[PDB]
Structure formats: structure tokens, C-alpha cells
Amino acid sequence: NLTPLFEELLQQCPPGGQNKTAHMVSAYQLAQGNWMPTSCHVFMGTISARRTKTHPYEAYVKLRELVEEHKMKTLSSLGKHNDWIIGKIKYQGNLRTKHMLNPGKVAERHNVYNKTIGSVMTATGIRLEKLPVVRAQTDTTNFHQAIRDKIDKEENLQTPGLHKKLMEVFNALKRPELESSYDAVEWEELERGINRKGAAGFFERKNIGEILDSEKNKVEEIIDNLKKGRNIKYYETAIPKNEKRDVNDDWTAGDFVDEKKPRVIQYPEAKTRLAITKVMYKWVKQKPVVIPGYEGKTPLFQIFDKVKKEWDQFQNPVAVSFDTKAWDTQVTTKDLELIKDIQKYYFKKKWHKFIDTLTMHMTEVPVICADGEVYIRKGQRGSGQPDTSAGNSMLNVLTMVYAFCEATGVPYKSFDRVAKIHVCGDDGFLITERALGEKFASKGVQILYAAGKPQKITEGDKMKVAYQFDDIEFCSHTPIQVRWSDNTSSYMPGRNTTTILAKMATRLDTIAYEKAVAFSFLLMYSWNPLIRRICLLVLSTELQVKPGKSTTYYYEGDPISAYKEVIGHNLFDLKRTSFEKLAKLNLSMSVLGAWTRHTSKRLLQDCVNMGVKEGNWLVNADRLVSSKTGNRYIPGEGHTLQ
């Protein structure tokens, strides 16, 4: 017989659940005969069978090949940790990627017009038909090509020994007063500013709020294992821009943040977003600001006021822009390893394992598409990661300081003595003397390729150089200057009049909201009289209704006093808007034909026709309206919130 040799292998065949779905044969009736396996796993002494007339040796012959087959799949590809995603596959994958993995698939918001604000515009002659559309979506056929055109690529060639020279740079701007101090935050500070409707991962069913409401302990798990050193089932989810699941966990300082978003948004599970944030809150939100020149916490109206205070100190100043062609897909793995080392400098000793583990996942990122198509990302930064704004910024300044010093020979220590730098994620610029700025302008497009951050096509391979202050571009705005009553000057954030009217009149699937929008726009665009007069005309409607709260800002009490609180001047005090700069930004209106010759005066007459009746009328907040209407506006106490 052969059973004494069959008991040998049985005490080696892997365990399994005793399944009665078929025939579970004996540890000895195998050597009987005609009982050959079709599966291996033992139920404390059984396997499958087939009644296939096998010889007492043909049984052992087959079974030992399954044990060889099991000791093989168990004990490559798809990462050294991400191997779990193979289970969730069911179909073969059509994505046609040439530079990264693609193992199959898994089982798988219209924008509307503002009633009040839009009606106001049409009444003056503004043709909304001739205005840019600012919320278009995209087809999935177009979406699939977007991944092949932008995302699937081998990590760019970062020059030998570069990430040492980048640490050489960070060593200068390090903050020893904060070294090894950061810690996890309590659930209250994290929850304070959080969007209760944050998007959920592909395998998730509840959103950021419900995760907080019910399974707050499940997030505490992800935090523990990561802090202990265990691999977690890290996945990211990929959706196109303006998809119903493109939702920000934090507050955007303007409608421009969602605008400098890439076509392809990658975000981890909502439970994972909170796990990272309840820990790294001090870095990701950048609660103390550490990356020099990071303006993500700065509000829009002072962004250029703060800068002109530095531009006015250089004997002959110039500015240079960072146009990194699609920055998010330009991040090598040594980069994530660098930001990892940075995060360890300011975080406590207990939390390094959290940083060590999480970074390992962020290098080999498995990303599930909207239709189920799963791909493996060759590094790069997911645009929806918690570390995006924080990490990208630190990466921008370290690269751009390197590129500046490398093109000009200025030591890394002596950088602040010859230049100032401002960034926001990947967008930013850099101010210095005319002499130095030209070197970094020409040699820059080269040195930046060497680092792996390729500039755009540009002109003659020279970076964008701003010679006069008001030619700077930052956060999709440009500096425009206003002159107040008391003859002072101050720069406000400027933009194209069409691009503002487009973003102001549209929604995304409510008079209170219409007013909070008009106030939020007045803080930034009171320099544009066509827009100031619109905002006053909407705010002066239905003064009973308190304003909304879902937009960037809103007001508590009297808006003309809230404006005073944040701008440092009353809207009445706006005496003159810069002559030349207001031409350039109004010009897009005439080329598109969005206004008429009579539009400028017609908007003004409606304000004068409103605030001429005896009393205290909002529209009188305009300097000229009040000027020809005789009255003034006396506002009570008002404040600004978000």
C-alpha cells in the first residue's frame, strides 16, 4: 500500500475549510484507488476527488504537484506590498499603458446659473453667452487618454547626487527650534475645519463625515498599524476633473485652487485621509508654517501687499515664474524619500515609523479608476493626497533654490541675502536683482530638466521673467494697484474681467448664497468697478436674508464694515484703480463681445437710481455712486468669516 507515504504529504498540504460542496476523501482511501484530487487544501485530513480511476501512485503524483504549485504562488510584480489588489480583480484590463502596470478591472454634476447674480449682469448688457465656460467635464474616452498622456511614465531622470544637494539646501532653512516636536492632534482640532462631505475611496461607502460619526475607531486602526510598521491596504482612486467626487477636505482660499487642479485626481480612501491627518496635521495643513514662502495659509487680498513690501527693497528687482509642466507627475521616488526625511526632522521619534511606512506606499501607488480599471503608479504625487500642498511646496522651494544657486553660484546658506521666494503647491515665483534673475532665467530651463522638473515649452528656453511688479502672476491672479482717499497706494489681486464674471455667475448643481458669493468677490475684486457695483447691487437686495456660508468667505453683520476689517480701508475710500492694468484685464471683454458701450454707464445708473432715495443705502458704498447720489453709507459692526 501507499498510505504510510500519503500520511507523510498530508501533514504538509496546506489547511482549508471542510467543504461539503464536493467529495472530501480519506487520508488513506487515497491509496485505495480511483480517488485523485482536483484541489489540495486539507480539512484535517481530506482533499477533493474526481473518481477518475487513478492508480494509488497517480494520486500522490498529482497532489505533490499542487503542493509544489501552492509553495510557489505563495512563498513577483505589482509591488512588494500592493500584492493584495490581485484579489479584487475580475476582468482583464483595457488601458493600453506602455510605461506602467495595468492588471484588469473591478466590478464598478451640471453647473447652473446664479439666479440673482446672473439677472443683475444681463440687466446692464453683459452677454453671458459670450462668457467663458468655467466648469466643463470630460468624457471617459477622453479620460482614458488623459491617463496615457499624462500619468503613465517612468520617473524622470534626477541627476546623480541631487537629493543630497537638496538636503544640503534644507539644512539651511531647517528650524531646530521645532525639531522632533510635532505630534498627532486631538480629534477636535482635526474635526474643526473639515468638510463633512469629503470624497470616499472606491471600496468605501461612507464619506468623511460618516467615518467621523460612526467608525472613528477604524481610522484609529490605520493610525496604529502605520505607527507600528505594518503595511496597510493603501489604494488611491482616480476621477476626472469636476467629477462629483472631486471634493476638498480643507477650505480653498479662492476658486483658483480647484482651477490649478490636474485633469486626473488621485485620492486615497476617506478613512485613510483622516488617519494621515489626525497624525500629520501639523505638517500637512502646515499649522506652523515651515516651508519658506508657502502662501497656502495666506488669504488672497494681502498676497500681493505682502510681496510688494519685499519687491521694494531690491535696488533693481525682477521676478521669475515656475511653470513646471504638469508638476504632479514629475515627482521621483527619491523626492518622496526626501520629503520623508524632512517630515522626520520635525516629528517626534514615535512617529517616524508612520512616516517610513506611509512613504513606502506612496512610491508604488495602486490606483483604481472610476470604471474599475486598476493601474500601478510609477511614483508621482496623487493630487488628492493630504501631503500634496505641504509636500509639493517644500519640493518646489528646495528644487528652485537649487536651480537658482546652481545657475548663479550663490551659496545655499546665502540665498535669503539675494532673493525671496513664494510658492503655493507647485505654482510660484522668485524675486531678486536684475543681474541674478537673468542667469536663473536662461540657465533655468536646463537645470530644471536635470532635476526632473521640466519647465513648459516657454520661449527661447528662458523662464518667465517679470520686470515691472504688476506683470507678476501667482495663484492665477496678477497685481493691480489702487489709490485710496488718503493718497496711499496698495495692490489688490487682479484678474481678467471675463474670467471673473464667468466664475461669479455659475454654480454646480439661494439668495443667501448669492450674497455670500458677491461679498467673497468684493474682497478681492473691489478694484474692478464693474464688479464692485455688481456686488453692492446684489448685497443690497433682501437685506433681511442673512448670507450663506458654503463659499470661500461670508460676512457677519454689515458687509461694508466687514470689508473694512479685512482690507484695512472702507470701500468708499477706493478713489482710483490703476489706469493701465485695468485696461489689460478689461480687454478680454471687448474681444469676446461680452459687454456693450452702454454697459459701463448702465450699471452705474442703477446704483445711483437705487441709493438716491433718502436713507442709508448699500450702493452708496461706491465712491462715485455716493458722489453723484448725495448720500453716504453709514455701516454698523460687521466681520468676515469663512
Author numbering: 13 to 87, 91 to 123, 131 to 531, 538 to 670
How is this structure described in the published paper?
Compared to the RdRPs of other Flaviviridae representatives such as the NS5 of the Japanese encephalitis virus (JEV) and dengue virus (DENV) in the Flavivirus genus and the NS5B of the hepatitis C virus (HCV) of the Hepacivirus genus, the pestivirus NS5B contains a unique ∼90-residue N-terminal domain (NTD) that does not have notable sequence homology to any other viral or host proteins. The global conformation of our CSFV NS5B structures is consistent with the recently reported CSFV structure with an RMSD value of 0.9 Å (95% coverage) between the reported structure and our representative C-682 structure. These structures together reveal that the NTD adopts a globular α/β fold with an α-β-α-β-β-α pattern. The NTD interacts with the palm of the RdRP core intra-molecularly with a mixture of hydrophobic and hydrogen bonding interactions. Collectively, these biochemical data indicated that the RNA synthesis fidelity of CSFV NS5B is fine-tuned by its NTD through the intra-molecular interactions with the RdRP palm.
To better understand the nature of the NTD–RdRP intra-molecular interface interactions and whether they regulate the RdRP fidelity, we designed point mutations at the Y471 and E472 sites in the context of the WT NS5B and the N- and C-terminal deletion mutants. The other two structures, obtained using the C-672 construct bearing the Y471A-E472A double mutation (C-672_AA) and the C-672 construct with the E472A single mutation (C-672_E472A), were solved in a space group different from those of the WT, C-682 and C-672 structures. The NTD–RdRP intra-molecular interactions are fully disrupted, and the NTD is rather involved in a non-intensive three-way interaction involving two symmetry-related neighboring NS5B molecules in the crystal lattice. As suggested by the two open conformation crystal structures (C-672_AA and C-672_E472A), the NTD–RdRP disengagement might occur in solution. The effect of E472A mutation was highly consistent with AA mutation (compare lanes 4/8/14/18 to 5/9/15/19), while the effect of Y471A mutation was slightly smaller than that of the E472A and AA mutations (compare lanes 3/7/13/17 to 4/8/14/18 and 5/9/15/19). As a small and unique globular domain, the NTD is connected to the RdRP through a flexible five-residue linker that could allow global NS5B conformational switching leading to disengagement of NTD and RdRP, as suggested by the two crystallographic conformational states identified in this study. Although NTD–RdRP disengagement, a situation mimicked by the crystallographic open conformation state in a crystal lattice or the N-91 construct in solution, results in fidelity reduction, engaged NTD–RdRP with perturbation from point mutations can achieve similar level of fidelity reduction.
